[PDB]
């Protein structure tokens, strides 16, 4: 479980960039379930990162 988190943070970027395409076309049927997936993907272990964040 070292490459899973990197694959996750790679997936979340394309899901964040598909919103601009769904908005450009004008088809919010997919842009709504994609927004729900985007908010459904953000966990807390992903953002742990390093020790002295703050």
């Amino acid at each position: 479980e070292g490459l899973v988190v990197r694959c996750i943070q790679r997936l979340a970027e394309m899901c964040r960039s598909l919103r601009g395409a769904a908005r450009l076309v004008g088809e919010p049927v997919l842009g709504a379930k994609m927004e729900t997936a985007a908010t459904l993907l953000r966990r807390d272990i992903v953002f742990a990162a390093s020790l002295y964040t703050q």
């Binding site: 953000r42 807390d44 953002f47 964040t53 703050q54």
Partner: protein, 237 residues
């Protein structure tokens, strides 16, 4: 001009004066009292009450207790509020006073510049104050003194929030109050009180939630014994 410790549990009126015990003492006057010279003045109607815990020391505060609806923020009170805006990096919330309060994105448990919490507009939050002086908008934090949120944060998913007067809240928040135990004997319940005049209830059935919502606002009146058992029996149905 009567004297204190003699008119305890007596209805007073604005403009009246009373004599505290003789040797000026440093007892602080409460909400409805103001200290002038070596006398006390009454500015609110109500009933005198005095609380000194267990000892012959101070041990003692003078405060009248009345019935009213308008709420003034007091430092250290548990107040339920409703979010109103999301301007900047704060969370303006309506508590019921003259001015709205102000949260911060990091005030929640484990919140940083990345893992911000989800707070929408028009949601109810359980939280405590840390600054409530009459010099700034009140500000509230929402986890703990130490930092572990003990039930605090955003609450309420399948209940009802209604409004009652400050008197019923004061009556319920008593160490010798048997209201909640008997009311919960009929209908199991869980409550989250708020010192701004708000209550969150959640029964099992929607009918029971309606009944608890209506019958809790009337418990400030209808004194127990000769009245309460018969009212409970009548509502059993």
């Amino acid at each position: 001009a009567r004297a204190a410790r003699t008119v305890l549990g007596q209805v007073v009126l604005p403009g009246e004066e009373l004599l505290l015990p003789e040797s000026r003492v440093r007892v602080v006057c409460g909400p409805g009292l103001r200290r002038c010279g070596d006398r006390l003045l009454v500015t609110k109607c109500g009933r005198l009450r005095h609380k000194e815990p267990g000892s012959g020391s101070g041990g003692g505060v003078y405060w009248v207790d009345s019935q009213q609806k308008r709420y003034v923020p007091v430092k250290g009170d548990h107040v339920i509020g409703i979010v109103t805006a999301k301007s900047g990096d704060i969370f303006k919330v309506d508590v019921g006073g003259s001015e709205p309060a102000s949260l911060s994105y990091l005030s929640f448990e484990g919140a940083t510049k990345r893992n911000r919490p989800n707070v929408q507009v028009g949601d109810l939050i359980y939280g405590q104050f840390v600054v409530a002086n009459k010099d700034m908008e009140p500000e509230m934090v929402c986890i703990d003194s130490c930092g572990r949120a003990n039930g605090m944060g955003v609450i309420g998913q399948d209940g009802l929030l209604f409004k009652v007067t400050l008197g019923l809240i004061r009556k319920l928040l008593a160490p010798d109050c048997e209201i909640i135990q008997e009311v919960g004997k009929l209908h199991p319940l869980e409550i989250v009180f708020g010192m701004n005049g708000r209550i969150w209830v959640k029964a099992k059935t929607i009918q029971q939630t309606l009944i608890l919502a209506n019958i809790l606002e009337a418990c400030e009146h209808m004194t127990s014994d000769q009245r309460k058992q018969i009212f409970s029996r009548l509502a059993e149905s």
